[PDB]
Amino acid sequence: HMQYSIEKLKKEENSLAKDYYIYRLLEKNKISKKDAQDLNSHIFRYIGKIKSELEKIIPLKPYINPKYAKCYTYTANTILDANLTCQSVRLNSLVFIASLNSKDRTTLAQTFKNQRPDLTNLLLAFNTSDPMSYIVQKEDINGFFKLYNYSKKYDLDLNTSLVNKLPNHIGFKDFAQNIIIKKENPKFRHSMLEINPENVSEDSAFYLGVNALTYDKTELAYDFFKKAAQSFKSQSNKDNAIFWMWLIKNNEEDLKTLSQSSSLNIYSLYAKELTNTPFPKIESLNPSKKKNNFNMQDPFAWQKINKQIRDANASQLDVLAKEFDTQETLPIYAYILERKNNFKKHYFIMPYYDNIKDYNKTRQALILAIARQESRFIPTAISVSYALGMMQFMPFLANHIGEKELKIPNFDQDFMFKPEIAYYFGNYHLNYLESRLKSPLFVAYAYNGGIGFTNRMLARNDMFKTGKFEPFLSMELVPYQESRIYGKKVLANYIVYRHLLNDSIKISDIFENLIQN
Ligand SMILES: CC(=O)N[C@@H]1[C@@H](O)[C@H](O[C@@H]2O[C@H](CO)[C@@H](O[C@@H]3O[C@H](CO)[C@@H](O)[C@H](O)[C@H]3NC(C)=O)[C@H](O)[C@H]2NC(C)=O)[C@@H](CO)O[C@H]1O
Ligand SMILES: CC(=O)N[C@@H]1[C@@H](O)[C@H](O[C@@H]2O[C@H](CO)[C@@H](O[C@@H]3O[C@H](CO)[C@@H](O)[C@H](O)[C@H]3NC(C)=O)[C@H](O)[C@H]2NC(C)=O)[C@@H](CO)O[C@H]1O
């Protein structure tokens, strides 16, 4: 490999690459207390392992606004001795409110009834055995979400008037998504059958459709999915909603509209196959030029050219298109062309093909499918979790395969930035997953979320079994959003690559194999 001292890193631009190499120093204990002093301002994304690792060296004291400093010297026993500003600041915390004695909640409720009746409602609510039931009786919507955030355990029936107020609050999106996907708060869930589709849109409308289906309310479901179809920004999400309109009410205009979609996704591909519509046009990228001056193995060069491409006018893109129109830079070319045709055309490149042409055509397609979604084939790709290269191996996994299993001499996790190694480790890991899971959809779930996650999901008696709307409904209820989306996208990619390799499979065969018989 190649190493970077903290001093060389401090001279590179802030980026995930620089963060990755700082994290490597921290995990090998190579950052002194002295080196760590100014280090916060050299970190692009100060979240997760790099933060908990830096704070083992230089602990951070949780920020308190100097205006309110004196407000945090009071406790539940002395809050009545604080000025009215301090009293109102401390009451932002429901935990603080829960900690007060009931007589001091009655006193502060009276004090704030006039200018802050939100605080009065929460104080008087915690003087009852069911704060949620009190807040719901007041139809205090801000209080409702502050309570939900304090504890997910509150559950109560909500009437038509109250549930139709919830969508107007910022918190409604996450609330509806989490309780429907996690199958928690059954009374909240049942209550959301009465939300007017007029009052919701986009993701929330869609999840309220999935909710209606779980109660076999097919009419309410169609209406939610239709509103989702009308309001969603991305054609891919519209297609998903229109598919549900079709599956529930079987109007052949919905399926026609879906078969004619400019988005390539499992729903449009399926609709095309049901209507004997031809397979969509795939762009053909074949640059004659061999190489250029750019190092595809320099993670720092990628992070920098990535930013330039994001922030380029039409004029600079046409200059970048020409520079990067080579076989060695094909994945960057495809990325520039995607931005330059304003995301209208279908690019499914097959770079470093020599490394996979000896595997059977089905395996080539799964590898390419995963690589396209993982990295867009960028060899030095780095995730916010520092998953590495074209196939986005987490370090623990790259090291387990490289060191324990393959005993590669002088193995370093940065070998995942080499196409040869990424494709090779991809094949090796896919043999592990495919031997246990079979379906390329299940393999996709396990590649992104893990075989543990996937085994526990498939073992549930309500996931990927026989039913009216299966396996489509199961694909909407995969409990980890990243994995739910990853499966749909990789499956679409798999169908396309199998077509380009003259090893076509019908997506309807894939869907039949998802139901465990
Ligand atoms: C080269 C480039 O910037 N291309 C654009 C794409 O980035 C963009 O879609 C997103 O691609 C990235 C990979 O570049 C995807 O990130 C990966 O997500 C998977 C899980 O799905 C995760 O396991 C990987 O670690 C992660 N990789 C990295 C490097 O973080 C991301 O999920 C894609 N976005 C979506 C919505 O799926 C496409 C489409 O907008 O545009 C290209 O121009
Ligand atoms: C491509 C990539 O890096 N993907 C990551 C996932 O692999 C990872 O999920 C976890 O993967 C490991 C490695 O396969 C799983 O560990 C295995 O667990 C089984 C039983 O559950 C055990 O018998 C195996 O011996 C063990 N192998 C090793 C080498 O430890 C682990 O279970 C997966 N985790 C879950 C929650 O399923 C995920 C999340 O860590 O990240 C991906 O990026």
Side-chain angles (χ1 to χ4, degrees):
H1 58 133
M2 214 218 149
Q3 281 139 311
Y4 307 91
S5 67
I6 191 53
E7 290 95 5
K8 275 221 292 145
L9 288 173
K10 278 188 166 156
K11 290 187 181 150
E12 293 289 352
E13 290 176 39
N14 282 22
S15 86
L16 282 170
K18 173 163 158 152
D19 286 4
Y20 168 56
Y21 283 117
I22 289 158
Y23 182 72
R24 282 201 80 184
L25 294 181
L26 287 170
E27 68 173 342
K28 291 196 301 275
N29 317 304
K30 284 175 152 287
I31 308 288
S32 63
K33 185 171 159 164
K34 289 156 184 193
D35 293 328
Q37 291 303 328
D38 57 340
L39 206 63
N40 282 252
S41 79
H42 288 277
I43 290 180
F44 182 85
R45 187 183 168 282
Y46 188 75
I47 303 180
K49 299 151 294 166
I50 195 174
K51 158 175 157 79
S52 41
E53 215 53 61
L54 181 60
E55 283 172 10
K56 286 194 188 206
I57 308 173
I58 289 168
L60 198 66
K61 303 205 142 206
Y63 184 62
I64 282 167
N65 183 346
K67 183 130 286 184
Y68 302 140
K70 162 214 162 61
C71 304
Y72 291 99
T73 67
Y74 301 100
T75 71
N77 293 348
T78 62
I79 191 62
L80 292 193
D81 306 342
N83 71 34
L84 196 80
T85 300
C86 283
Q87 285 186 359
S88 82
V89 164
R90 294 306 301 281
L91 294 170
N92 288 321
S93 167
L94 267 56
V95 162
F96 184 76
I97 293 174
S99 83
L100 302 166
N101 94 282
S102 57
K103 294 216 313 296
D104 292 346
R105 281 199 297 257
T106 293
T107 300
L108 293 165
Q110 271 159 209
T111 297
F112 283 109
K113 196 178 88 193
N114 217 79
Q115 52 159 8
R116 293 295 303 281
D118 57 306
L119 295 182
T120 296
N121 286 339
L122 285 166
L123 290 154
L124 289 176
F126 278 91
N127 280 0
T128 74
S129 42
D130 190 3
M132 176 55 75
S133 159
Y134 184 98
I135 286 293
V136 165
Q137 199 278 342
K138 289 295 197 236
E139 303 225 341
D140 181 348
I141 307 306
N142 282 337
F144 179 86
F145 282 102
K146 291 208 75 173
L147 267 181
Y148 170 73
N149 285 332
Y150 160 85
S151 178
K152 306 294 171 277
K153 272 84 223 288
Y154 297 129
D155 197 31
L156 197 77
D157 297 283
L158 314 169
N159 69 23
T160 302
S161 177
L162 188 98
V163 286
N164 280 291
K165 290 176 178 169
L166 302 178
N168 311 307
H169 186 293
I170 46 154
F172 182 67
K173 279 147 178 141
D174 286 355
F175 166 92
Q177 182 186 153
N178 279 307
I179 74 160
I180 294 157
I181 296 306
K182 288 186 177 172
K183 300 205 187 226
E184 283 176 356
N185 306 88
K187 302 188 173 178
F188 289 170
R189 266 204 290 121
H190 185 264
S191 301
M192 290 194 307
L193 292 180
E194 300 318 300
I195 292 168
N196 196 340
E198 284 175 347
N199 286 318
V200 287
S201 68
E202 305 209 61
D203 297 81
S204 297
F206 186 91
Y207 290 128
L208 286 168
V210 170
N211 194 51
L213 289 185
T214 65
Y215 292 102
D216 205 32
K217 292 287 198 261
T218 63
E219 281 300 299
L220 304 181
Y222 168 86
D223 286 345
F224 281 130
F225 282 126
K226 182 185 207 153
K227 176 56 182 288
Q230 270 153 19
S231 53
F232 260 137
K233 283 291 123 76
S234 90
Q235 184 62 52
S236 187
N237 289 329
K238 293 181 182 298
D239 290 354
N240 196 156
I242 292 159
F243 178 74
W244 279 105
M245 292 165 63
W246 180 66
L247 207 64
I248 299 161
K249 261 204 161 306
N250 319 111
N251 176 358
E252 277 163 52
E253 292 308 292
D254 294 333
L255 187 68
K256 260 206 57 160
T257 301
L258 181 61
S259 65
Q260 294 177 330
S261 168
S262 65
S263 170
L264 207 166
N265 56 70
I266 57 159
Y267 304 106
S268 61
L269 286 174
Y270 189 41
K272 280 182 162 64
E273 172 185 305
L274 288 170
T275 56
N276 187 49
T277 312
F279 203 81
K281 180 169 214 276
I282 310 305
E283 293 309 286
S284 177
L285 296 190
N286 217 354
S288 32
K289 235 177 147 220
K290 184 110 278 151
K291 271 169 195 288
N292 70 7
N293 295 300
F294 183 87
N295 185 6
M296 295 291 297
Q297 297 304 126
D298 183 354
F300 294 109
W302 166 239
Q303 293 295 322
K304 186 153 180 200
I305 208 74
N306 191 24
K307 186 181 290 174
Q308 280 177 48
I309 291 155
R310 283 217 199 288
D311 212 28
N313 54 59
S315 190
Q316 297 154 314
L317 278 181
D318 292 357
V319 163
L320 287 167
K322 287 170 218 210
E323 190 39 58
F324 281 101
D325 188 13
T326 85
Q327 278 164 73
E328 177 73 78
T329 63
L330 182 52
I332 296 175
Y333 185 56
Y335 166 50
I336 292 162
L337 287 181
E338 227 164 319
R339 197 150 300 250
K340 198 234 290 209
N341 299 125
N342 285 314
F343 300 86
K344 274 166 216 192
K345 280 175 176 161
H346 309 315
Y347 297 106
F348 285 76
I349 59 163
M350 302 188 314
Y352 319 108
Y353 187 56
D354 268 16
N355 302 303
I356 61 164
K357 76 167 147 42
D358 292 322
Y359 306 133
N360 69 50
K361 292 205 167 211
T362 294
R363 178 52 63 81
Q364 299 181 20
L366 185 57
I367 293 170
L368 292 164
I370 281 160
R372 183 173 185 272
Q373 177 62 23
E374 284 293 7
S375 63
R376 297 282 146 141
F377 297 107
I378 302 293
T380 65
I382 298 161
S383 95
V384 295
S385 316
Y386 319 133
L388 306 167
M390 292 201 318
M391 300 294 286
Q392 286 289 280
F393 276 90
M394 290 287 277
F396 85 93
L397 190 48
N399 287 321
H400 174 72
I401 295 165
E403 277 173 351
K404 265 251 190 180
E405 308 282 54
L406 268 37
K407 284 177 289 281
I408 297 171
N410 307 136
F411 181 74
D412 188 71
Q413 61 186 52
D414 288 4
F415 280 19
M416 304 320 298
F417 294 151
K418 284 159 177 181
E420 318 88 69
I421 294 293
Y423 279 157
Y424 188 89
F425 280 43
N427 187 61
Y428 179 107
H429 187 60
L430 286 170
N431 287 330
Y432 170 76
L433 290 175
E434 201 174 66
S435 81
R436 273 166 204 71
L437 291 173
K438 261 57 63 94
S439 168
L441 181 59
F442 296 167
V443 167
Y445 290 148
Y447 194 96
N448 172 264
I451 185 128
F453 164 62
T454 303
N455 284 334
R456 277 182 293 278
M457 176 180 67
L458 291 176
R460 288 173 52 186
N461 41 62
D462 66 344
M463 294 294 287
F464 291 101
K465 304 302 170 263
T466 62
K468 250 211 282 205
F469 295 129
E470 295 297 355
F472 310 109
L473 187 61
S474 289
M475 294 174 76
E476 303 303 349
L477 294 172
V478 174
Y480 169 66
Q481 170 171 31
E482 173 173 333
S483 268
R484 187 162 66 248
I485 291 166
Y486 181 90
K488 293 182 185 190
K489 289 216 147 155
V490 163
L491 190 50
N493 291 350
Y494 172 76
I495 297 314
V496 175
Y497 276 119
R498 276 196 69 163
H499 198 274
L500 289 165
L501 289 168
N502 285 302
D503 179 40
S504 275
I505 188 159
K506 326 205 80 226
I507 192 162
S508 76
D509 294 335
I510 277 3
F511 292 145
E512 278 167 45
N513 301 341
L514 301 182
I515 301 146
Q516 344 262 40
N517 294 320

